[PDB]
């Protein structure tokens, strides 16, 4: 999908999430993998879940790296 659209969906879904200030979604938006709007939604949900697994209420870059890898294949 559109790289611009991909960014919009990521910022839209994570707009209600509590990301640490250093997280930069462009690391994911910029990847070459062709992913669906559903995958971005799953990546985002999986990130929140991984945060919860660490009893952490803030989501980190590591949660996103992790979730991205899990969802995308």
């Amino acid at each position: 999908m559109d790289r611009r659209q991909k960014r919009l969906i990521f910022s839209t879904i994570t707009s209600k999430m509590n990301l640490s200030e250093e997280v930069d979604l462009e690391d994911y938006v910029a990847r070459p993998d062709k992913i669906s709007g559903a995958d971005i939604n799953s990546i985002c949900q999986e990130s929140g879940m991984l945060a919860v697994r660490e009893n952490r209420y803030i989501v980190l870059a590591k949660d996103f790296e992790k979730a991205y890898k899990t969802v995308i294949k």
Partner: protein, 229 residues
């Protein structure tokens, strides 16, 4: 509100300056105690932007280049979270400007992606490699151009960043500016020498990737730069 399993780190993030100084002055080892994310009080203080806490730690002599489990050094965190003062403090203390995290990014990739102008300049004045490539072969300029960060694109070119580096998809920053219709970015890149001729991996040039009209504008501007000089 509890971001770590180690209390001193929660104190660091929550900005509890007096308690932090107090506990650490009693047990100096707390200053470098690692949490479940391979983070210490420094990483967390940088993230939240508590300059004072960071200064205390640095005067104490804590290491400034230790990376967390995702490979993020305190400078990556501060730069990204847009903490100017902290970034400055870190540089005086020897923070590594070209350190990479798990995805190959240097602190400059983040400063540029997130419009941290002043920080980008400090990093660049500090020896930052403008052409550092991440694990997908993308540079700070790819991020700035793609997102429409005009002034940041100026800053990178002005510190001589190369405009024709191709990422794993074969795209240069102009390709990205074009594909996302970042008009002024694209025009500035071509006026600054970016090539309108490089085919990416889908064998498309920046022109073919842009809006019909945008392509014709860049075409004209590129030939203008050719003509003169």
């Amino acid at each position: 509100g509890c971001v770590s399993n180690i209390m001193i780190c929660n104190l660091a993030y929550s900005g509890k300056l007096d308690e932090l100084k107090e506990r650490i002055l009693a047990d100096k080892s707390l200053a470098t105690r690692t949490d479940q994310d391979s983070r210490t009080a420094l990483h967390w203080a940088c993230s939240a932007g508590h300059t004072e806490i960071v200064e205390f730690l640095l005067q104490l002599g804590v290491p400034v280049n230790d990376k967390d489990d995702a490979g993020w050094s305190p400078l990556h965190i501060a730069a990204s979270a847009g903490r100017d003062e902290i970034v400055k403090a870190l540089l005086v203390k020897g923070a590594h400007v070209n350190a990479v995290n798990q995805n190959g990014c240097t602190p400059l990739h983040y400063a540029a992606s997130k419009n941290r102008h002043e920080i980008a300049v400090m990093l660049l004045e500090g020896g930052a490699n403008p052409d550092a490539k991440d694990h997908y072969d993308a540079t700070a300029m790819h991020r700035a151009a793609a997102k429409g960060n005009l002034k940041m694109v100026h800053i990178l070119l002005f510190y001589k960043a190369s405009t024709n580096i191709q990422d794993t998809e074969g795209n240069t920053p102009l390709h990205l500016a074009c594909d996302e219709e970042r008009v002024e970015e694209a025009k500035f890149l071509v006026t600054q020498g970016a090539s309108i001729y490089i085919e990416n991996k889908e064998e498309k040039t920046p022109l073919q990737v842009a809006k019909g009209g945008l392509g014709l504008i860049l075409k004209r501007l590129a030939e203008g730069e050719e003509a003169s000089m």
